[model samples]
Target: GSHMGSRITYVKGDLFACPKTDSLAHCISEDCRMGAGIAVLFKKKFGGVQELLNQQKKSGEVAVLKRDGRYIYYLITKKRASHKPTYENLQKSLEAMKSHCLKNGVTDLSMPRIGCGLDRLQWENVSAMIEEVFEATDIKITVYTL
Candidate 1:
């Protein structure tokens, strides 16, 4: 089997409290309704609802907002806040973010268990999807827990 070049780390702490230079990501619906969970924190801290809305991102794609020289990735995995995210859309959003990272020189990335929190996806599967999507890259991914 081929070795994965990308590195993934797990830490016990707040995701937002990570290093300022680290890029951040979280799952959201295409509607950008971040009314609950960690997403509410992202929206409150980043305060780019309109900016992300203006991007017109769709499910299976990603919307990005840059602040203080770091990027915030909004992974659009479902069409509405009430909809559940499939692993397929989550993987696609991860891939989209991966492409943007590779193009933009983003190396340090941090996030919660992503789809596992409110989205209820299995961490075992979601982590594997993240690893597979970034397998060939040198990006350092840090999974934060609180």
Candidate 2:
């Protein structure tokens, strides 16, 4: 219990909160797809996840991008919309993200209900994974809703 656990805040707002400050925009991505679901909105705002797509980023891999002076971090956590979300992949993704946060000296990440959208996963499952993966860090996960 002595470890500095991460803080997760549920807020009724968009992830665009403080796009120019110390923050990261996170979203789940399909292994083979791009520009769809909430991620499409990111594409609409930025150009697209072409680099990530081209690399064929594996599941649990994180794609960090800077758009219009905004830091965006997206993770490939699913194979497709019909595919179900896995706790392990989500866990791995979050782990890498935590490392990024620490190495880059950035905190205060805002994200939506990842893996619960088109991926068709339970919030409870993902929530638990989030807690498990980030509980040892000081990262504050601000989950936003529409």
Candidate 3:
């Protein structure tokens, strides 16, 4: 399927993947009940997702990319806090994730609504910035939210 612009997919607070590989990538956060601050789940074999979550917990942010077969997963995490994450911080996190994915052989990437749930950010703001980031990047990017 051709990649579309930002779209929303609803889920019942559980982890899932796209039926087709080219569709949106899905992930789950480590703090299950709190929901994903900015975490992505790849195949269990790639430990980067879990590792990145741990790092983000300590550093307030972490970005990771993991590849399994032809699938590439971009896993990002933001600091869980009482305040919302700024657009600047969100871009920084996206950049970090992009760098890691490129280093890990990920030519394609997917992003979710950062700071939307946990940080109480507006989806419109986050989505626009995320689209801009993808347009600026050389790799193919998909941005979606649940």
Candidate 4:
């Protein structure tokens, strides 16, 4: 019932192929590496996340890396693979996305069920976080579940 133009669909395909700006991010200490679940796929395909890791990029931040020449927003939402999503970091990522979207004129977005899977987050929490941040910004989000 929020202003977020949100939708969800299930399919078996590649999430990295999702062209919309992204926001799933993470880690610190204990390797803080992209070594599990969907992060693995991103590592193999985009590798920008890995590069960011190599460069000692901190968690709880956002970075836009070009994937195959397309823009993908990265959200540093967790600290480690076993770490749960953090509200503070997640909120910052959304704020970053808001600025990024407004600056880039991107109104539509697509992502996997954010904060789920490897991060072991609950959808309800994640959805609320997104709605709270982007709903008022008039961003259309499509969450593809596969």
Candidate 5:
């Protein structure tokens, strides 16, 4: 494991940082620039990387993109009951997202814990379904929460 400051640590290669400040939108380091790697903000919500990329794309606000070398990243959020995030629906969304990324020559992919937040689904169940669908596909997966 690795250490970052007083409250942050990494298990394997994934960082698990403590929430010291009120806003996750605040920069992790004073020297850190405006838009950098994945920065957790708004409780379970994330900002910085995905947000910046989405601003650049200007097509859709959320989806996956391949940067280079077997590493792909995306931003995903659970829809409310009014906004469903069922297994079948999520699968459809993933397929459509995959299609879009493929058109841009992207393959690998990563996402957060869908349906676990405002969607009110259990993390274990959501994780299982995500694992099932992603396992059958060729894309890589990264699940994050705070």
Candidate 6:
């Protein structure tokens, strides 16, 4: 086995507008309120709050939704939507998503600058953490901005 290494691409556009063939990911709270920010858009487009709820995911875990033959990965970073997320939790959530990807043959993912918008997470640190988590794999990560 070889580490092909992952690629992190930054795109200037809407995340949802990206090809649906590519899996998508975003951060959310364990409570699944999804009331504000990009998460609201995710909730609106995906509309699987009940499914995610059924998984009973907690902070530092991941909730998933399958649509259009691709998986929508939800990183649960906090206990409540009103609560802020810690780096440790975000890291753990990424690890969970990585595990899922490796097991499921998910190679490409499109995402926003997660944990940054209303959550106020530093993009620099977040991106670096993301890279560190998937460094040994062939996952291609696309981060959107618009």
What is residue 53's positional error in candidate 4, in angstroms? Answer: 4.1
Off by over 4 Å in 5: 1-84
How much lDDT does candidate 1 score? 0.91
lDDT of 1 by residue, 87-119 (tens): 999989999999999899898899999999788
Q: Rank the candidates by TM-score, best first.
A: 6, 1, 2, 4, 3, 5
What Cα-based lDDT does every candidate model obtain?
Answer: 0.91, 0.70, 0.46, 0.61, 0.37, 0.91
The worst-scoring run of ten residues by lDDT in candidate 6 lies at 1-10
Q: Candidate 4 — which pairs collide?
A: 25-75, 25-77, 26-76, 27-79
Worst lDDT 10-window in candidate 1: 1-10
Which clashing pairs does model 2 show?
A: none
* Per-candidate count of clashing residue pairs (backbone under 3 Å): 0, 0, 2, 4, 0, 0
Local accuracy of candidate 3 as per-residue lDDT tens digits, 1-146: 33443343333333334334342333233342233344324444344545554544322234343344554333233343333556666666555555555565555554455457656778888667666655544566554545
Error of 4 at 9 (Å): 6.6
The digit string of per-residue lDDT tens for model 6 on 22-109 reads: 9998999878988999888989998988999999999999999998888999999999889889999999999999999898889898
TM-score per prediction, in order, is: 0.96, 0.82, 0.54, 0.72, 0.41, 0.96
Runs in model 1 lying further than 4 Å from the true structure: 1-4
Instruction: Tally clashing residue pairs in candidate 1.
Output: 0
* Candidate with maximal TM-score: 6
Estimate the lDDT of model 3.
0.46
In candidate 3, stretches whose alpha carbon ends up further than 4 angstroms from where it belongs are 1-15, 19-50, 53-61, 65-78, 81-83
